[PDB]
Structure 1
Amino acid sequence: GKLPPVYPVTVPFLGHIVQFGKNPLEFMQRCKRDLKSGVFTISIGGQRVTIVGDPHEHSRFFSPRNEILSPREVYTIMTPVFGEGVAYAAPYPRMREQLNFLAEELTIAKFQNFVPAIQHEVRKFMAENWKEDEGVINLLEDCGAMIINTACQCLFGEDLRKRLNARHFAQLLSKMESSLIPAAVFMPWLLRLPLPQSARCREARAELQKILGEIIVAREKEEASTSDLLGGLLKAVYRDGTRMSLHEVCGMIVAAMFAGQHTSTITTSWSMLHLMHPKNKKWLDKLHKEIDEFPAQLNYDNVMDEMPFAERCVRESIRRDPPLLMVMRMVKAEVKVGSYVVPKGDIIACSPLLSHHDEEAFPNPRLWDPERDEKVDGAFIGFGAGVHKCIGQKFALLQVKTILATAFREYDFQLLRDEVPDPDYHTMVVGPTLNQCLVKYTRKKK
């Protein structure tokens, strides 16, 4: 085998994470240029990280099975929050079955009544918060509130929402996030030591599990028709003929809510931010034309089948600013990538950021252009690819499209600074800088 070339080891401890939090794109482009190779290795905290930064080789990265490019070792930071024996922390066979059970709950087939539930919360929100003829809001925080409120209406039954509302859900997820050390992907030794915040999060999730249990007992003693997410997952049956444990169900619900909270929020925000920008009026007008073709009450078919332009807007906002900068796996057995082999124990990564800004794939990559197409097949990896592709993608897109169509139909927006906000690359999920997201809404003439 030929090893990819290697950026030589630097002295500050985890110093490359600082660069990755400040200018990740430029850092990776430098690595690529200096070593004259799209496939290259860096060393972070003693751990080799090999980045497939050539769009043409995406298939090598996304094809292999979890047994061989495993996500388990790279997501050890998440075990306290989701639970032992849940998702990435489960043996491979159970892992695959659990993920699939969640994927089954979020198929287009399961979305009956979701668009009206979403429209209802959004309208409730706009009437509570956007009351005036005119007013100033933080668009990032309000999208975030709408994402959690709308997800909770779609996924959880009324009895569940009565005991556990979106605000409590939001707090719990936010507390959990605050307990993580994202750098510890490169500090596996740390995660073997006792961490107090870890015990705290497990009690928090155990409290959630208690609520969930009480709900099931109450539903079981009043029935004659549990087709919400909780209900669906409790009815799943593994290949061996057993059921998921409530522990496992609770964990998968947390993971689903945790996954969508920032990614979908960010995507909504960027999309709305580009569309209200004056130099994009042409695309806004185009969006209104599409929306006005439709009544007030939307449905699944309108949003998902009959809004191709709104789709290009959302996709191109994920293209330009992907909220997850890296997809990563642990190499469990060595793998070929072009003329190279990437050895076992390496972390192998593919970067939606680096790849969405490749000039060959996306000519003039700093331009937000909803009409563009990829020049390289598979270079859009906003939701990953292959067999492990985002299983929440259709649910996320339904939410974002519905919120977009409801909001722009009822309100005009103006960004209260000249340029679109800069991404803030310091956070785990990357989105627009919070203090640059002030916007003025104006209620449209009824």
Structure 2
Amino acid sequence: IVGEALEYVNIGLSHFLALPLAQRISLIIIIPFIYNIVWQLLYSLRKDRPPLVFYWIPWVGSAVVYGMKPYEFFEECQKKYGDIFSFVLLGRVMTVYLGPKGHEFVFNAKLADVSAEAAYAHLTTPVFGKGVIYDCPNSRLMEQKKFVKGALTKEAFKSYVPLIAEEVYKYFRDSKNFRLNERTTGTIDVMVTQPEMTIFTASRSLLGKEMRAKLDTDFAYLYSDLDKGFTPINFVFPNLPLEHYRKRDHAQKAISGTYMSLIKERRKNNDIQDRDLIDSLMKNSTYKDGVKMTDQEIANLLIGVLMGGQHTSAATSAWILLHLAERPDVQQELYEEQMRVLDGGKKELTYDLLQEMPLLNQTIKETLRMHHPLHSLFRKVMKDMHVPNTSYVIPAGYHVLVSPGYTHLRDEYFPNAHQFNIHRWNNDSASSYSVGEEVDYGFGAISKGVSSPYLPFGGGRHRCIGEHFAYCQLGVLMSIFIRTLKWHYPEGKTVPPPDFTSMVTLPTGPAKIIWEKRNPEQKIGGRH
């Protein structure tokens, strides 16, 4: 007789529901806390699952330590478990595969196994708009990248270089942070100057003179509002109604509206040349199945393409300025390269001459090695994936996290990895290179192997298409900085540590350097 025991299950439940509000709250906390803990212990039994990092608080998982110092988190985990391990992150299970094998396993994964758009769309679609990037099937993305690459050709870069140079000089002339016709020395915050210099140079050359002229007005404020939707807090709550969410949505309509306006006027005048990305997409945005991109979609694609490049590039020139500020030896060497290639300054900077500045391109390369703008790249796992040479299975619904930026900082692949050393790239100054066989996903032949320990631009179907644009812009900018200014730190200041909490891993500010003119009496012409 134990039906008598079932009587007391019933009675027991009855007394549960009758406990005071204090104990019941105490229990709605202690009961998932405990379940979680035995669940992990039970989980670590399975040999077909990668090791899972232990955590106390349910749902939150390892969010706090990962969110604040993800490379230290990765390293500590790698010591305990090796290169494959999992951890819970605000609701989700992230499986990290560290090292070159990890790049291979994730970047070169089969289309059917993983989805970038499933990982990213909830974050990007509201910022950029509907119908493009991650708000469309992968095949559509592939053709958009193709369309955009058509405004990123060598001949495009030859015409961008003087426009970008004009903008840097205008900024030296007019911005309160410099004013080189009035001041010979000054303090700047690189996280104030570099985003402005970036948006100004990127706008003028990819969007055109009209759009660049709008940045001189209050309209510029909308791009900032748009940033606030592109944060690792929309990370988790994609849409819950308070005000910076509205300003985001408002900015998107307003900016896309403006782009659509210029598009429609250019077509109404047949004022369609080869100046911009705008001209380019208007002439070339028909998918292979014959469907044309709408004017809304084109405008949304413009926002998305310029947003990403804006923050990665601005963060990178800020890090460059910061590393160089304590290396007058490297400024000196870069300066000598400038005098030699540009014949004392008597040659005008062109895209061709940029390619003959290996030490400048190595400086960019090395900065990107020590400061990858994105410490983590994600895919949602769509089908149970087996991990080669293990018994590990990664179930659908998990996420895979790859981190080439972590490998960038390993001594095994980069001797003295925490040292800024541009000469480690002697006779290897290329932004990237395919050491063999290629493949084409729809936007041109890129490398098939994604095993390089140096992968600032990722690889596989989702690979960056902006690398050459970014070197062009960073190149021109840094060439003018070097030729015009020397700079150094305020007393006792040094290279700041990264802030990893933002979307990109910019430096912890205020990040200030002191500039001074190389030629105090040099004037920059033009009306203002």
TM (norm. structure 2) is 0.77
- 1:10-25 to 2 correspondence within 5 Å? 10-11=56-57, 13-14=59-60, 16-25=62-71
- 1:3-402 to 2 correspondence within 5 Å? 3-11=49-57, 13-14=59-60, 16-35=62-81, 37-75=82-120, 76-129=122-175, 130=178, 131=180, 132-162=183-213, 164-165=214-215, 170-180=220-230, 182-183=232-233, 185=235, 187=236, 190-191=237-238, 198=245, 200-223=247-270, 226-227=273-274, 228-235=276-283, 236-277=285-326, 280-293=327-340, 294=342, 295=345, 297-303=348-354, 305-338=355-388, 339=390, 340-372=392-424, 378-402=452-476
Query: 2:312–2:504: 8 Å Cα contact kept in structure 1?
Result: yes
Query: 1:331–1:346: 8 Å Cα contact kept in structure 2?
Result: yes
Deviation at 1:180, TM superposition (A): 4.5
Aligned length in residues: 436
Name the SS of the counterpart of 2:105 in structure 1.
helix
In 2 relative to 1, CA 118–192 (structure 1 residues): closer, same or farther, beyond 3 Å? closer
Query: 2:133–2:301: 8 Å Cα contact kept in structure 1?
Result: yes
Deviation at 1:61, TM superposition (A): 1.6
Q: RMSD across aligned C-alpha pairs, in angstroms? A: 2.4
Deviation at 1:71, TM superposition (A): 1.0
Deviation at 1:194, TM superposition (A): 6.6
Name the SS of the counterpart of 1:442 in structure 2.
strand
Greater relative contact order: 1 or 2 (C-alpha under 8 angstroms, separation 6 or more)?
A: 1
Deviation at 1:413, TM superposition (A): 0.7
Deviates more, 1:285-294 or 1:202-211: 202-211
In 2 relative to 1, CA 415–442 (structure 1 residues): closer, same or farther, beyond 3 Å? same
**Unaligned stretches of 5+ residues in structure 1:** none
Q: Distance in 2 between matches of 1:77 and 1:225?
A: 33
Deviates more, 1:149-158 or 1:403-412: 149-158
Name the SS of the counterpart of 1:439 in structure 2.
strand
Deviation at 1:167, TM superposition (A): 6.0
Q: Distance in 2 between matches of 1:423 and 1:359?
A: 19
Given residue 333 of structure 2, which amino acid in structure 1 is its aligned partner?
A: K
In 2 relative to 1, CA 4–109 (structure 1 residues): closer, same or farther, beyond 3 Å? farther
Deviation at 1:250, TM superposition (A): 1.1
1:258-297 deviations in Å (ceiling 9; x for gaps): 10222101111111221231xx333222211211121452
Deviation at 1:378, TM superposition (A): 0.8
Q: Distance in 2 between matches of 1:283 and 1:409?
A: 13
Query: 2:225–2:251: 8 Å Cα contact kept in structure 1?
Result: no
Name the SS of the counterpart of 1:105 in structure 2.
coil
1:212-256 deviations in Å (ceiling 9; x for gaps): 233233323434674311121122211012321111111111111
1:370-396 deviations in Å (ceiling 9; x for gaps): 12259x961112211233211111111
What is aligned with 1:424?
A: 499
Given residue 306 of structure 1, which amino acid in structure 2 is its aligned partner?
A: E
In 2 relative to 1, CA 191–263 (structure 1 residues): closer, same or farther, beyond 3 Å? closer
Q: Distance in 1 between matches of 2:423 and 2:220?
A: 35
In 2 relative to 1, CA 337–356 (structure 1 residues): closer, same or farther, beyond 3 Å? farther
In 2 relative to 1, CA 220–140 (structure 1 residues): closer, same or farther, beyond 3 Å? same
Specify the structure having the higher radius of gyration (Cα). Answer: 2
Query: 2:228–2:248: 8 Å Cα contact kept in structure 1?
Result: no
Name the SS of the counterpart of 1:322 in structure 2.
coil
**Unaligned stretches of 5+ residues in structure 2:** 1-46, 429-449, 523-528
Name the SS of the counterpart of 2:87 in structure 1.
strand
Deviation at 1:433, TM superposition (A): 1.4
